[PDB]
Every structure is written in C-alpha cells, then in structure tokens.
Amino acid sequence: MNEVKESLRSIEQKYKLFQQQQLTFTAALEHCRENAHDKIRPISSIGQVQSYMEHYCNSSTDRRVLLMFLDICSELNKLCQHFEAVHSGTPVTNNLLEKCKTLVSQSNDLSSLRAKYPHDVVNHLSCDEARNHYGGVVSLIPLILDLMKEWIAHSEKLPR
C-alpha cells in the first residue's frame, strides 16, 4: 500500500498547491467561460474542462494552472488502477471503487458534489459562483481525497 501511498502524498502536495492557486484557477475558469461565451450551463465535465483549456485558454499562468489541474486528475486516474489491484475487497469496497471510477469519470457530472467539513473551498469561493457555475470543479478534489482516505482505512481494517 506504500507504493500507492507515495503517489497519494504527492497528490496531496499537488492538491495543496491547487488549493493555494484556487483563486487563479477560478479566474482561469471565468476567463475560459467568457471566451467560450456559454455561461448558461455550469461546468460539469472533465472533458469540457479539457476542451476549455485547449482552445479558450487566455493567459500563460491560466494555461499552467489548467495543465496542473488536468495533470492532477490524470494522476488520480492513473493511481486508481494501482489502488484497484491492492485488495479484492467486499461489496462495499467494490461499490466505493465504482464511486471512485465515477468521480474520476469525465462524462460524469460534478455539480451535485460538495466540499467536506475540513475543506474550506465553500468558505473561499463566491456564493453564486460556486452555487451555480463552478463549485463542483473546485470541490471534486477534496471529496476524492476523503474517499481515498476512507478506502485506505477500510482496507486497513479489512483482514487480508
């Protein structure tokens, strides 16, 4: 479990960097939405975020932040395969693995997700902007980290 845990700690450092650059990420998301001129629907797809970064990215720092966020998502997707082969698990473990796959899925939505109690992303982002436009993209990382910690605790409590 330590081999996946090293990548988990690296992803924790990367998520800390993204939380520090949350304001820059929000500014980049607003600039991409203004360039795409489609503010009616909220951001819901990782594929939509990638398409926003490919064409509707304005600044070099914004492009770097979008690339860092996409690289964090790709590293999470790559570490999901290594976490899958750790243990066989129970039916609840399989359900949580399917939930992790759905959370890493680009086609699955993100607006219905919300930040956890330790996270302060809701306490940082704007009221209407996170309520209706881009709350889920900010909140997806901490819920995924909490689910990974819960899965690690479940595997630790589960006998091999």
Binding site: L17, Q20, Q21, Q22, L23, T24, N58, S59, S60, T61, D62, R63, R64
Partner: protein
C-alpha cells in the same frame, strides 16, 4: 494597487539592480524570462507594485536604466537576468561622466535626460496610485552622482508631493577607490539634502567587513556584495507589498524617521548573519536576534554605536515569530541601552512584523536607523574636502566646464551646515 517607479543611474546600481531584481523575482516565483511558476496567489495580489502586466499573461519590469557609457547597459542586457527588461527601459549616451560631476551634468547630461524624462511620463502615467519614485545611485561614480542629482532636481519640481527614496552607496574611510570622492560626494550632497525624501547610506568597507568576520565566505565576489545590499532593501519594501500582522508603508517609515527636514540619511543592517557551517549550531530564536541588531559588528557603516547616537530605529521583522516575545524584548533592549538611544524621544523604536519570510529562512530582521555618527562618516569627507580645496586640486576638470568658484565655497559651507545641525541638536 500601489505602484512606485525605479530609475537607475551609474554602473554601481546596475550591479545591485540585477541582483536586487533577482530577489523580488525570486520572492514572486518568476522565471528569468519573466513568466510565472509559483505556489500561491497571495503574491499575485500585490505583484503589480513593481511590475506591469503584458498581453499573453506576462509581467514587465518597472525599472529604467540610464548611463552615458553604454557598456554596463548591454552587460545588464546580456546578464544572467538580462532577457527580462523591456527594451525601451534602456537609455545609453555617448560620452561618459568619467568620474567627473561636471562632465555628466551640464554638457553631456542635458542631452540624455530629455529623452529620459519622456520615459518618466511613460512609466509614471501608467500607474494609478503612484506613491513616488526610487533611485539607486552612487557617490563615487560620476554618472550615478552627477546625472542622478539632476534627475532628483527635475522629478521633484514636476511631481511635488510624492515619496523619494534613494539607496546610495557612500565613500568609505579605507576603501577609497576614486581620487575625486570628496569632489563627487559634496557636489551631490549639496543637492541630496536639499531635494530628497528618503536617503539610505551604504558603506563599501562595512560590507567587506560583514562577509569576513561573520559570514566567513572564502571568495567574496561582487555577487556576494550585491546579495546582502539587495536583501536589505528587499526587506524594506516587503512591508509595502506583502501583508503582515503589523504593517508600515514607505511613507510610514518616512514620517517617523525624520524629525528635522535636513536629517534624512539612514543607516541599515540585516539580521541573520548565519554561517554556512554553523546553521545547526544556532538556536533560531529572537532572543538571539536583538543582540545581533545592536552588536558592535552588525552595522553597515563605519559608525560605532559608542561613537554614535541613535535617534530613531526601525526593526522590520520578517517570518513567523510570536508577538509578545518580540515586543517585550524590544522593550528590553531600549532599557539596557540607556545611553545608546536618545533621551528626548521616549519610545524611540518601531517594530514591524511581516508574516511571509524570505525564501529559505524561518525568521528575518532588518535593523534600520538614523545616527549622528553619519556625520562622523561625513567628517572624514569634511576634513578631507576642506584641506584639499586649500591646495587648489583638480579645478580644471570642473572649473574648465563653466561653473563659478563661489558655489564650491557654498558646498563646503552647506556640508558644514549639515554637520553643524547634528552637533547642535546632539545636546
């Protein structure tokens, strides 16, 4: 939000200004090209202080470099951080000042500065809340001294109520490396006292003394000499740009350090003189620091505290340190320094705490003060300037250009006016 413009003159600050703009770029996580690869957005809120934005997400310098000898411009342009300055910031002339105050002022300076003054409106009018200007120059070199003081004259008249900060290197007792130093300095300090808000004095000899007795660097090249001088003025400006638990702007230091108008020469210092081999031998503690801000060795001039008189002291602390331990120990040291600080201003000192440290260091302090013994730094020039005029030295390089002999006698009285005021109000 708050913006202040930097003008550069002389080859001296051309060597600081590459190192000085290294540190602020280092503090803001900026690549040598000029783009951004950082961790937090906190610096980006007040990264606009000394830069402007550019299209395509780029940040351009607010630093204009002027010299009459184009050699140091291109070297700065081709230096380690040479591809960052925007290419109209450089202005270069033809005939250098030649360490002559006269040569760089009237017959050669006037042709350059009119094109330079057009660059001043291009940089000043871009800023919304322009607090003032800074200028790094030299008293030993001709272009930094003579042409710099002309800029001091022209900018203040057109922009009357701003803040003028000058970080000037001053002549030394035993590292006198130019023959005309009491001619160059006196023809500048005749206009420096008259027309400058903030003046900082840097002594070369103490910088050699700092890197020897406590740093023990093996080869103290000018990169090391520019390193601390940049770091001191980096810590001066971080309270204007970076938020701390107790903040102080640049005018905040300007109002309280200056009781009388003609006394605005400042003596600075930098605290962590930690060596390369004894980092783990030092308890990184503020009870180590206060005897390091007020030791017999950590000053940056040839002005001993027992030969001096501390009017005002600003101790800008940088890093994550507790409030109460610092505030009591600042109360501690003023008490035991009974005869070292002045008596007719009780509660002499300002503490200043900025939360964010410099990189690679937990806590950091800068000791900045005004002392009367800067006149003892000046009286070395004053005992050298008066006797040298009696034997009629070096007039042809000056009086052959066109100034009368009478205002040279005014300067030795005007420089005598300055040291008279320190001695009168000492008691």
């Amino acid at each position: 939000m708050r913006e202040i413009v930097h003008l550069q003159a002389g080859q001296c600050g051309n060597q600081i200004g590459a190192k000085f703009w290294e540190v602020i770029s280092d503090e803001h996580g900026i690549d040598p090209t000029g783009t951004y690869h950082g961790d937090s957005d906190l610096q980006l809120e007040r990264i606009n202080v000394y830069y402007n934005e550019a299209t395509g997400g780029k940040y351009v310098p607010r630093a204009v470099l002027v010299d009459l000898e184009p050699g140091t411009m291109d070297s700065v342009r081709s230096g380690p951080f040479g591809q960052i300055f925007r290419p109209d910031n450089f202005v270069f002339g033809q005939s250098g000042a030649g360490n002559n105050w006269a040569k760089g002022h009237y017959t050669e300076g006037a042709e350059l500065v009119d094109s330079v003054l057009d660059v001043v409106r291009k940089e000043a009018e871009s800023c919304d809340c322009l607090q003032g200007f800074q200028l790094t120059h030299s008293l030993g070199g001709g272009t930094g001294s003579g042409m710099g003081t002309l800029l001091i004259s022209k900018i203040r008249e057109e922009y009357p109520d701003r803040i003028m900060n000058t970080f000037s290197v001053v002549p030394s007792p035993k590292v006198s490396d130019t023959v005309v130093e009491p001619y160059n300095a006196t023809l500048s300090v005749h206009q420096l006292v008259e027309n400058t808000d903030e003046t900082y004095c840097i002594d070369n000899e103490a910088l050699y003394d700092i890197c020897f007795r406590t740093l023990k660097l093996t080869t103290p090249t000018y990169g090391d000499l520019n390193h601390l001088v940049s770091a001191t003025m980096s810590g001066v400006t971080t309270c204007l740009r970076f938020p701390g638990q107790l903040n102080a702007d640049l005018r905040k230091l300007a109002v309280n350090m200056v009781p009388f108008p003609r006394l605005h020469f400042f003596m600075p210092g930098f605290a962590p003189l930690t060596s390369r081999g004894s980092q783990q031998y030092r308890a990184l503690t503020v009870p180590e620091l206060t005897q390091q801000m007020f030791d017999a060795k950590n000053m940056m001039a040839a002005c001993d505290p027992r030969h001096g008189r501390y009017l005002t002291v600003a101790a800008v602390f940088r890093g994550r340190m507790s409030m109460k331990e610092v505030d009591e120990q600042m109360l501690n040291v003023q008490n035991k320094n009974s005869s070292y600080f002045v008596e007719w201003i009780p509660n002499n000192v300002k503490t200043a705490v900025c939360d964010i440290p410099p990189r690679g260091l937990k806590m950091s302090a800068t000791f900045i003060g005004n002392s009367t013994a800067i006149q003892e730094l000046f009286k070395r020039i004053s005992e050298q300037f008066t006797a040298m005029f009696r034997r009629k030295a070096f007039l042809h390089w000056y009086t052959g250009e066109g100034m009368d002999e009478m205002e040279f006698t005014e300067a030795e009285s005007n420089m005598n006016d300055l040291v008279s005021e320190y001695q009168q109000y000492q008691d």
